[PDB]
Design a protein around this ligand. Structure first.
Ligand SMILES: [K+]
Ligand SMILES: [K+]
Ligand SMILES: [K+]
Ligand SMILES: [K+]
Ligand SMILES: [K+]
Ligand SMILES: [K+]
Ligand SMILES: [K+]
Ligand SMILES: [K+]
Ligand SMILES: [K+]
Ligand SMILES: [K+]
Ligand SMILES: [K+]
Ligand SMILES: [K+]
Ligand SMILES: [K+]
Ligand SMILES: [K+]
Ligand SMILES: [K+]
Ligand SMILES: [Mg+2]
Ligand SMILES: [Mg+2]
Ligand SMILES: [Mg+2]
Ligand SMILES: [Mg+2]
Ligand SMILES: [Mg+2]
Ligand SMILES: [Mg+2]
Ligand SMILES: [Mg+2]
Ligand SMILES: [Mg+2]
Ligand SMILES: [Mg+2]
Ligand SMILES: [Mg+2]
Ligand SMILES: [Mg+2]
Ligand SMILES: [Mg+2]
Ligand SMILES: [Mg+2]
Ligand SMILES: [Mg+2]
Ligand SMILES: [Mg+2]
Ligand SMILES: [Mg+2]
Ligand SMILES: [Mg+2]
Ligand SMILES: [Mg+2]
Ligand SMILES: [Mg+2]
Ligand SMILES: [Mg+2]
Ligand SMILES: [Mg+2]
Ligand SMILES: [Mg+2]
Ligand SMILES: [Mg+2]
Ligand SMILES: [Mg+2]
Ligand SMILES: [Mg+2]
Ligand SMILES: [Mg+2]
Ligand SMILES: [Mg+2]
Ligand SMILES: [Mg+2]
Ligand SMILES: [Mg+2]
Ligand SMILES: [Mg+2]
Ligand SMILES: [Mg+2]
Ligand SMILES: [Mg+2]
Ligand SMILES: [Mg+2]
Ligand SMILES: [Mg+2]
Ligand SMILES: [Mg+2]
Ligand SMILES: [Mg+2]
Ligand SMILES: [Mg+2]
Ligand SMILES: [Mg+2]
Ligand SMILES: [Mg+2]
Ligand SMILES: [Mg+2]
Ligand SMILES: [Mg+2]
Ligand SMILES: [Mg+2]
Ligand SMILES: [Mg+2]
Ligand SMILES: [Mg+2]
Lengths: 53, 235
RNA sequence: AUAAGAAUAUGAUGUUGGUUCAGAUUAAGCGCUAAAUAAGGACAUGACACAUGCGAAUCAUACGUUUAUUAUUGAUAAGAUAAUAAAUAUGUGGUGUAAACGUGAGUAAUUUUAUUAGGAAUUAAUGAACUAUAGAAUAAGCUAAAUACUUAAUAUAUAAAAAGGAUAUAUAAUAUAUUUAUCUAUAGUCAAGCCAAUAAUGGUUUAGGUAGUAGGUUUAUUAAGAGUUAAACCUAGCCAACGAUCCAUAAUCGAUAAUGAAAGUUAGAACGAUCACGUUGACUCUGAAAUAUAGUCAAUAUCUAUAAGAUACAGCAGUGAGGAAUAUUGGACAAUGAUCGAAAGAUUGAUCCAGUUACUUAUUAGGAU
RNA sequence: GAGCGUUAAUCAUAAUGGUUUAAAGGAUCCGUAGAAUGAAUUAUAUAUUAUAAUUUAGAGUUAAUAAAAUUAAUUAAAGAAUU
RNA sequence: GGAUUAAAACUAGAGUAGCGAAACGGAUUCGAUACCCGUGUAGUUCUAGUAGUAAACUAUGAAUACAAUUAUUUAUAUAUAUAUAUAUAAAUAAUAAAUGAAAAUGAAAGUAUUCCACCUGAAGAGUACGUUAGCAAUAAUGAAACUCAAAACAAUAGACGG
RNA sequence: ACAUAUUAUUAUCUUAUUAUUUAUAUAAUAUUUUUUAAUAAAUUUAUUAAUUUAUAUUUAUUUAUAUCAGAAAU
């Protein structure tokens, strides 16, 4: 018998799916939004470079 | 993984669900340039209270269970402590029965000796009446009684000789038979080994298959097993 | 891998044995002496007391307030409205000060340090503040007004939100567009809590210690284990001559410094890592995290405004004191950073430089004849 | 040598030691712990260790045979001399 | 940790011839709190205890493996043409080797292994203080400061010796 | 001996503050609630001040426990 209130087995290792990690962390913009603004264009360029990296 | 140690249970039954386990680890002492064993006692959780003092157990790290308890019993590697408890209980019953039997065999022997001390008749005197009545023809009722004191219904010269037999005599004959067997076994094997042809035949006669193709030790054991199967089984 | 001895006993000899010397070094002081330059350091002592000036501000594109001009209105000029250009940070607001800097008092470890390819309770509806993506941003009240605060609405058992401002254009205050902010969710990044094992000074002429003490069960509390804290009920344990308990002393350590052939020994100033503290003690608030250099009360000292007041230089410079002994009441935000701001920019005793001082190191301090 | 000296300190400079007679064998033995040490063969293992089986050279038990009359405790006696 | 532990000493009760701390006398002597003599108390003896100390010495802890000889005893065994002879151990003596400052050790103080106790200049000091134990005397444990460059052992050659 | 200073402790005494926990109010505020005046608008309704009613949030006093600190003892 293992101690009462304790887990008999060790917690399961968490294996990372890089495809899922990429999908949740650096997801692509869902729509091709209209970046007519100067600040919108800069933000779009920075986001694209960050996602590529 | 969780840190596991091997140790001997050194205390049990003093705390509820807690035992003390002695863990010895190997360390190097730079000062004396020697690899030493370092010892430490662990307070260990025993959920099932199965372990006993003397057991060899494996303890595994757990969550904090008390101020000083951080390990639990994970397996009983050897259960010498549990065996000790079982053998002690059995001994009390086993010894009581034997002592009762021996006490009854001592009182019985005492009664027989007391009974014999109540019979004034003595072996010498009784054997002097069975040898005078057998040489004179008189048959006083004492003889009939003597035929009950000893069970010797018939009074002949070959009945007093069987009333006075000493165990030593039997031992002397058993010893001669024992010596004969040993001497015969040795001479038989000694001769067999001297004659390889008679040896090969000997093995085949006793049921060996191609004894010729055998080693000295692999075959002398067969010869020894056969010589001792021809002087101890037939007798 | 790199390992040297010497002087001193004795009448003389051999040996035992201590003492001292030859080497290197310093957070050094002192005596005598002293040229320039470059670089590295500089109160180890009283966590003693401190005159004076500085070290934390910033935002006017949150709200409010105040001018001037022009136009319209006001049949006489007091005001109103809009545009434009300024002013206001002694009004309400936001963000910033849990860091950095300094110090080593406490701390010998239920707490601190170091280490491990350690662990679970199998750690919160925590983001602190950036990144990627998606969605949302509603109605009242209170204040003079608001991106203040309060109460509601709707948003992953379901719970739990918000905020507008600036600039254009079109409308008749509204709508779009741009720009900068607000809120929520998911992941990442950064970053937190808890536990184990091992090691960490001297004294037993401190030998017995312990009574929540050791363990079990349950509730409360927490994101979370556990006599961690509080309550209840049980068992009689737990630690200790391989040194318990107690006392004294001390911030700890390194790929740092010193030394040695090396194992080691010493230091812990300088560089870096960690911990603790900001005159002393306890407590509370906010918060993911604070017994916070905050707040509350008390203690000690000082001060002026005499108030249920303010201050506490272990931030920089500096002064008195103590001591053998440790420096400028300097310059600059040019560089690297940090904070505020949409930006323009503002602030920065962080920092960068210089000053003082042979404290250390290095170079130079004239060759041929 | 822009230092030199001196004081205060740190490291190094002999245990690749000793205890009849020079500092140092505990009066003696018994025996607990020892994180002290300790036989043989073979087979495994994760290996100078562990486990299992097997073995008798250390250490013990019993008996047989021979030998010895001491050392403890207790009780019962003797002797020369002395006053 | 435990047990035993000379002599002296102590507690209680018996004993007390001889011996004999002390005490009191006689001598010796310049003096004689001595050496010598007398009278001689405690003690020396026994029983029941306390105490755990000695030059308690081989000034040498215990165990195991091992190494060259002789001599002398002892023990066991063997043999005989019966009284010796031959073996194997132990003890002791003198040695080789080895070790050692040497004196010497000699089966250890040799060659090795294992475990325990103990030492780190002299003096202060086995003292002071504390503690523990004891009826007590005491026993165990056991420092530091100050001071010094000493201090000690074996051996050598002398000098000296009632 | 002892006179001092420092620290620690407590079956003791006093105790700021705070936390937790009691009891109380003709306590305050908001809402609800029962009525009542005054006032106002319109021609019943609203507002204000009271009373009744519960609810939540506070406040004052109060009970108990713990607690900085000081006193006494050791
Ligand atoms: K528990
Ligand atoms: K000299
Ligand atoms: K010397
Ligand atoms: K110097
Ligand atoms: K702004
Ligand atoms: K400073
Ligand atoms: K410190
Ligand atoms: K906007
Ligand atoms: K201690
Ligand atoms: K300094
Ligand atoms: K700057
Ligand atoms: K010696
Ligand atoms: K006498
Ligand atoms: K002797
Ligand atoms: K010994
Ligand atoms: Mg020197
Ligand atoms: Mg400089
Ligand atoms: Mg200082
Ligand atoms: Mg404005
Ligand atoms: Mg303001
Ligand atoms: Mg801080
Ligand atoms: Mg809104
Ligand atoms: Mg509003
Ligand atoms: Mg708000
Ligand atoms: Mg709300
Ligand atoms: Mg909702
Ligand atoms: Mg003392
Ligand atoms: Mg619990
Ligand atoms: Mg506790
Ligand atoms: Mg309780
Ligand atoms: Mg300190
Ligand atoms: Mg160190
Ligand atoms: Mg430092
Ligand atoms: Mg240190
Ligand atoms: Mg410094
Ligand atoms: Mg603090
Ligand atoms: Mg403080
Ligand atoms: Mg404070
Ligand atoms: Mg200060
Ligand atoms: Mg300063
Ligand atoms: Mg001075
Ligand atoms: Mg400045
Ligand atoms: Mg130089
Ligand atoms: Mg050395
Ligand atoms: Mg020795
Ligand atoms: Mg001895
Ligand atoms: Mg001795
Ligand atoms: Mg034997
Ligand atoms: Mg007597
Ligand atoms: Mg006399
Ligand atoms: Mg005794
Ligand atoms: Mg003595
Ligand atoms: Mg002695
Ligand atoms: Mg003797
Ligand atoms: Mg023995
Ligand atoms: Mg003594
Ligand atoms: Mg001599
Ligand atoms: Mg109170
Ligand atoms: Mg207190």
């Amino acid at each position: 018998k293992h101690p009462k209130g304790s887990h008999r087995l060790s917690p399961k290792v968490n294996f990372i799916d890089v495809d899922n990690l990429i999908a949740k962390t650096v997801a692509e913009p869902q729509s091709i939004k209209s970046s007519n603004g100067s600040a919108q264009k800069v933000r779009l360029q920075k986001a694209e470079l960050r996602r590529k990296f | 993984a969780r840190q596991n140690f091997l140790g001997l249970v050194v205390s049990q039954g003093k705390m509820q669900k807690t035992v003390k386990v002695r863990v010895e680890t190997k360390v190097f002492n730079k000062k004396i340039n020697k690899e030493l064993f370092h010892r430490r006692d662990y307070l260990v959780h025993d959920e099932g209270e199965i372990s006993r003092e003397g057991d060899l157990v494996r303890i595994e790290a757990t969550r904090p269970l008390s101020k000083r308890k951080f390990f639990a019993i994970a397996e009983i590697i050897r259960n010498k402590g549990q065996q000790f408890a079982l053998y002690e209980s059995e001994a009390q019953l086993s010894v009581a029965k034997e002592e009762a039997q021996k006490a009854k065999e001592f009182l019985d022997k005492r009664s027989v000796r007391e009974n014999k001390l109540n019979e004034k008749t003595t072996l010498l005197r009784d054997i002097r009446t069975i040898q005078d009545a057998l040489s004179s023809g008189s048959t006083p009722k004492e003889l009939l009684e003597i035929k009950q004191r000893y069970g010797i219904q018939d009074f002949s010269q070959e009945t007093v000789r069987q009333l006075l037999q000493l165990d030593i005599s039997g031992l002397e004959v058993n010893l001669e038979k024992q010596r004969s067997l040993i001497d015969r076994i040795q001479t038989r094997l000694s001769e067999l080994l001297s004659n390889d042809l008679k040896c090969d035949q000997f093995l085949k006669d006793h049921g060996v298959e191609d004894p010729l193709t055998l080693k000295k030790n692999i075959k002398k054991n067969l010869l020894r097993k056969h010589v001792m199967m021809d002087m101890q089984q037939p007798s």
